[PDB]
Design a protein around this nucleic acid. Structure first.
Ligand SMILES: Nc1ncnc2c1ncn2[C@@H]1O[C@H](COP(=O)(O)OP(=O)(O)OP(=O)(O)O)[C@@H](O)[C@H]1O
Ligand SMILES: Nc1nc2c(ncn2[C@@H]2O[C@H](COP(=O)(O)OP(=O)(O)O)[C@@H](O)[C@H]2O)c(=O)[nH]1
Ligand SMILES: [Mg+2]
Ligand SMILES: [Mg+2]
Ligand SMILES: [Mg+2]
Ligand SMILES: [Mg+2]
Ligand SMILES: [Mg+2]
Ligand SMILES: [Mg+2]
Lengths: 101, 349, 161, 65, 208, 51
RNA sequence: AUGAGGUGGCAAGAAAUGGGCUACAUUUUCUACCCCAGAAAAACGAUAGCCCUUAUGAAACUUAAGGGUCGAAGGUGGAUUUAGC
């Protein structure tokens, strides 16, 4: 029942990345050192590449939790600028007020 | 203003009063090392009057009571920037020249550790670098300062320059000086030979030596000269600095190592660094130890009034308000009686 | 109620309180490094590696224990303490002492009287004041007063006044 | 939580693998968010991975197991 | 303007504040009494009661400034004054006693006189009669005259014709030329006057 | 580089404080920093981003 | 299937034009210092190009940083036009 298909894709990607975070962490740790043999590093590289694409953490997009806007999303509140402005103007966000100085 | 112009007789009675230098003495003793602004002032006024100050007087007392038998003593002039350390050293240099010493004058050791376009490799020691341009400049200046002693003093070794050219024992030091000057590539080697010969022969009573080094702190500091591979160079690699360090050791006798710290022109030092340790570092302070530090402080009110009167009589202070007591007070405040600040202010005032 | 910052525990102790000798104190200072504020004479250990506050507290106490015991302990390589590895300047066997000794030897040789030796020269009060001034300049902050004291000492030693 | 050396006894006592596992253990000890079980899981996974890849290690002259 | 309209510009003159109370006219005493109960701005960082303070040189330094580098501008100004004074002293000493009477060595006086010489008396302003603007000659206020003198001097110095010549020397040389009523600045002033005289026929196009 | 005494004391301090005892370059310290923190994916702010 | 999913791929310059950054230097450039210095000065001038390394990333010729390499156009700019009390 997510906002849109793009949000659904993002949710699936987040689930998968969380699921495979540990294995990616370990394999990337193997790849990211100058100590181990380079042959071992190469096999680690091919393996990490062989992991499913959607598990890549970078593929996660921080969309607005409410309207699925892919840009202009404040991380602290996870709300697009439009929705954040709506709520703040209606005074529904604690401690947020129009700035003047 | 003193009728006393002999640099030995004047003392505390002359403290705070001027001391004149004749044009011939200025040309001979001081072909270099005088502050650029003082050189300009002399050019403008046609006269060279240095106020007699307690630091110079005390250094003169020490040099008059110096026992040439004892190992050469190190005197170190230190003080806030623009306190007149360089000109006090020049005053003592003139006194020594009139007493007929041999003045080994380093106008500024800072120049020898920075901004060198021509930095070759020493032929005598392949691990050391040459500074031929500055070496030749200083050699010319030293020749001018000490021509009269130059011929009289003899060498005591065989000094090869090329695979075929050399200087033979008993040759006058003027031969070495001429070789260094005319042949720029051999300037560093000539400077080293000159320093070594003077240091050895001073212990033999052939003369009284005065090693007067301005900006002595440079020798044991850092240098802004980078190798061909952009590698930083430490001072010891520079033969000139190495030989000068050798000279700066009290191991010999028959002379005095007078030197002045000078933060101006220093490298990797804060602006306010003026104390001996602050300006020398561990290595420099240990090398100079033991030494006699002499403090050069800003003008006391009497000296300040004397300098203001000197400028007024020369007519330098053109501002119509300069002669007034209010103008004098304003100058005193804006300069805190500092010699350099007062001179710069009066320049445009 | 969880709060990640809640797990940090700080342990502050004045080294004066710890029963440490001179060598142990110096070794402990070198080991701790910036964790020791000399201005306040306070060693601070901030532990946040363990998840729990109790675990971090236990680890901080353990770190204090191990640091103290190793500081009192001694190791073979310690004997190779170069001058560049000391923070308290020691005039003894120092460059300044060697230089002043050589100067005194030169002065007395010029006097031609071989009534001299290391102990004889170093026993005089003049050397005592000179070394006091040199140590003060080297360790304590330098100023006009200290420089003047050093000047007087050097003048007295060199017999020039 | 901190002293994880006791878990490395299965790995070679010296060599590139030992150095790498020392780094890994240092990181795990500094990590506060993971449980002791999770840290042990990481180390055991590394052990199993190297055991399986032993052939490559021996061909490359790194002794293991 | 952070200063409200009530605030008045400070007056900085020790002589004015030390003037005897008896010498004050009714209006002057009233002015002092009014200022006793008035708001005054803070003394600007550019001026002080220093007897050596020169407003003309202060304004010249401000005009010479580039990007708020008051330090560099003041340094250039003092270097120019020192160079002028040194040149005058050299000429004085090298000159015979008779002409030494005329040779002047006060750099401030030289600067003031050079600027006064360079001041253009009559300017060219666009005046529109019937919908067409023409460059009518016109009298200028003293403020505009002084500003034009200073601006011409500074622009002439900044020109690129003098290459590898430091601003102190450039400005000292040009100031001496102007003092002796020669040089490109005086030439420019004469050119402006010549253009005005040529366009004298359009003077009536002015209405004020 | 460094005096032997100071280097040995630094290694001892690292051992006491639980840091890497062996010499190591930054390329390999990457491993330490990786394992010292939760992966971005594991962070609750990430995997629980959406309500 | 104008819906959903997967792989790959475009996102370039003939050329014009808008805004900004860099400069055309001597009130400049480098060094030290943060304002009393020493050198440079036909050199000034790229954040452009090419090569290498590194950071992040699974993926870097194409993203960013650093270094090396090259020292290019340019020499205060037309009418016109922007901002500032
Ligand atoms: N005895 C003197 N006679 C004339 N002028 C003097 C005298 N002493 C100092 N001055 C003036 O002060 C300057 C000389 O002082 P000097 O530059 O040597 O000072 P300093 O303390 O060594 O400063 P720095 O920080 O540059 O080393 C010159 O401007 C000179 O006009
Ligand atoms: N070329 C040359 N230089 C000499 C000679 N004697 C002295 N010098 C100069 O002084 C240096 C040698 O001084 P010396 O007392 O041998 O000490 P060193 O420099 O430490 O070897 C040389 O590097 C030169 O600068 C000589 O015979 N030939
Ligand atoms: Mg992204
Ligand atoms: Mg000086
Ligand atoms: Mg579709
Ligand atoms: Mg480039
Ligand atoms: Mg990579
Ligand atoms: Mg170039």
């Amino acid at each position: 029942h997510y906002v849109d298909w793009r949000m659904w894709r993002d949710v699936k990607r987040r689930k998968m990345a969380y699921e495979y975070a540990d294995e990616r962490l370990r394999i990337n740790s193997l790849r990211k050192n100058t100590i181990l043999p380079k042959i071992l590093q190469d096999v680690a590289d091919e393996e990490i590449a062989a992991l499913p694409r959607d598990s890549c953490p970078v593929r996660i997009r921080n969309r607005c939790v409410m309207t699925s806007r892919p840009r202009g999303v404040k991380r602290r509140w996870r709300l697009s600028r439009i929705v954040f402005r709506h709520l703040a103007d209606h005074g529904q966000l604690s401690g947020i007020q129009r700035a003047t100085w | 203003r003193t009728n006393e112009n002999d640099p030995a007789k004047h003392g505390d009675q002359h403290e705070g009063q001027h001391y004149n230098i004749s044009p011939q003495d200025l040309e001979t003793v001081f072909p270099h090392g005088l502050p650029p602004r003082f050189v300009m002032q002399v050019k403008t006024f046609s006269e060279a009057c240095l106020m007699v100050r307690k630091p110079a007087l005390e250094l003169l007392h020490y040099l008059k009571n110096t026992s040439f038998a004892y190992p050469a003593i190190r005197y170190l002039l230190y003080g806030e920037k623009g306190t007149g350390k360089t000109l006090s050293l020049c005053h003592v240099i003139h006194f020594c020249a009139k007493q007929d010493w041999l003045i080994l004058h380093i106008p500024d050791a800072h120049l020898w550790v920075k901004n060198c376009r021509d930095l070759l490799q020493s032929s005598y020691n392949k691990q050391r670098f040459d500074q031929p341009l500055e070496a030749s400049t200083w050699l010319k200046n030293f020749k001018t300062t000490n021509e009269r002693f130059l011929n009289q003093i003899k060498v005591q070794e065989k000094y090869v320059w090329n695979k075929r050219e050399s200087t033979e024992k008993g040759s006058p030091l003027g031969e070495v000086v001429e070789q260094g000057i005319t042949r720029v590539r051999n300037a560093t080697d000539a400077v080293g030979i000159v320093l070594k010969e003077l240091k050895r022969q001073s212990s033999l009573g052939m003369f009284h030596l005065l090693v007067a080094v301005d900006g002595i702190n440079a020798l044991w500091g850092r240098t802004t000269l980078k190798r061909e591979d952009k590698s930083p160079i430490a001072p010891e690699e520079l033969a000139l600095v190495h030989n000068l360090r050798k000279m700066m050791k009290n191991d010999w006798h028959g002379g005095a190592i007078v030197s002045a710290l000078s933060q101006t022109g220093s490298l990797f030092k804060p602006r306010k660094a003026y104390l001996p340790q602050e300006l020398l570092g561990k290595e420099g302070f240990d090398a100079l130890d033991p030494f006699i530090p002499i403090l050069v402080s800003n003008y006391n009110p009497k000296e300040f009034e004397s300098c203001i009167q000197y400028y007024l009589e020369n007519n330098w202070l053109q501002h119509e308000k300069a002669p007034t007591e209010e103008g004098k007070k304003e100058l005193l405040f804006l300069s805190n009686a500092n010699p350099s600040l007062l001179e710069r202010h009066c320049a445009y005032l | 109620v969880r709060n990640p910052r809640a797990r940090v525990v700080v342990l502050r102790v004045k080294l004066s309180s710890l029963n440490l000798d001179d060598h142990a104190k110096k070794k402990l200072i070198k080991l701790v490094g910036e964790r020791y504020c000399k201005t306040t004479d306070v060693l601070t250990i901030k532990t946040d590696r363990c998840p729990l506050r109790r675990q971090n507290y236990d680890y901080a106490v353990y770190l204090l224990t191990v640091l103290y015991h190793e500081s009192w302990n001694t190791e073979e390589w310690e004997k190779s303490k170069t001058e560049a590895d000391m923070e308290e300047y020691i005039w003894e066997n120092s460059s300044s002492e060697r230089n002043i000794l050589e100067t005194l030897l030169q002065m007395k040789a010029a006097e031609k009287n071989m009534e001299i030796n290391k102990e004889e020269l170093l026993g005089t009060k003049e050397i005592e004041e000179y070394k006091k001034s040199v140590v003060s300049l080297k360790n304590e902050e330098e100023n006009e007063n200290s420089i003047s004291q050093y000047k007087e000492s050097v003048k007295r030693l060199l017999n020039v006044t | 939580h901190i002293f994880l050396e006791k878990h490395l006894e299965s790995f070679p006592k010296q060599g590139p693998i030992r150095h790498f596992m020392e780094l890994v253990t240092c990181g795990l000890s500094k990590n506060p968010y993971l449980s002791v079980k999770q840290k042990v899981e990481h180390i055991e996974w590394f052990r199993n991975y190297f055991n399986e890849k032993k052939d490559i290690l021996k061909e490359s002259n790194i002794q293991f197991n | 303007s952070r200063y409200s309209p009530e605030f008045k510009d400070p007056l900085i003159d020790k002589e004015y504040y030390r003037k005897p109370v008896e010498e004050l006219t009714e209006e002057e005493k009233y002015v002092r009494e009014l200022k006793k109960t008035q708001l005054i701005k803070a003394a600007p960082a550019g001026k002080t009661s220093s007897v050596f303070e020169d407003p003309v040189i202060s304004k010249f330094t401000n005009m010479m400034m580039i990007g708020g580098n008051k330090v560099l501008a003041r340094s250039l100004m003092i270097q120019t004054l020192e160079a002028v004074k040194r040149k005058q002293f050299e000429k004085y000493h090298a000159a015979s006693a008779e002409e030494q009477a005329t040779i002047e060595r006060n750099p401030y006086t030289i600067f003031h006189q050079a600027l006064k010489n360079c001041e253009p008396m009559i300017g060219l302003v666009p005046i529109l009669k019937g919908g067409r603007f023409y460059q009518v000659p016109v009298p200028l206020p003293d403020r505009r005259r002084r500003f034009l003198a200073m601006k011409w001097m500074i622009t002439e110095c900044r020109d690129k014709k003098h290459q590898r010549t430091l601003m102190p020397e450039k400005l000292s040389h040009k100031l001496l030329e102007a003092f002796h009523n020669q040089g490109p600045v005086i030439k420019r002033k004469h050119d402006l006057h010549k253009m005005a005289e040529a366009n004298r026929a359009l003077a009536h196009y002015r209405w004020w | 580089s460094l005096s032997e005494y100071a280097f040995r004391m630094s290694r001892l301090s690292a051992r006491l404080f639980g840091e890497v005892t062996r010499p190591t370059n930054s390329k390999s310290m990457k491993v330490v920093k990786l394992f010292s923190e939760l992966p971005l994916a594991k962070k609750k702010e990430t995997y629980d981003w959406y309500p």
